[PDB]
Amino acid sequence: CKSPGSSCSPTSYNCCRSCNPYTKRCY
């Protein structure tokens, strides 16, 4: 899994961190 600045739509599970909704990527 990813964690930082990685593309996410809402709960795309692309990252084990969280989805930063300003960049539509992870924190």
Structure tokens at 18: 């969280």
Sign of CA dihedral 20, 8, 24, 4: positive
Burial bucket for residue 16 (CB in 10 Å: 0-12, 13-18, 19+): exposed
Q: For the chain, which residues make up each domain, given as ranges?
A: 1-27
Tell me the DSSP string of 1-27: -B-SS-B-SSS--SBSS-EETTTTEE-
Tokens 């539509």 found at: 24
CA atoms within 13 A on the CB side of 4: 0
Technique behind this structure?
Answer: NMR
Q: Which tokens belong to 3?
A: 């964690």
Question: Smallest Cα–Cα separation from 25: which of 11, 12, 1, 6?
Answer: 6
CB 3 within 8 A of CB 26: yes
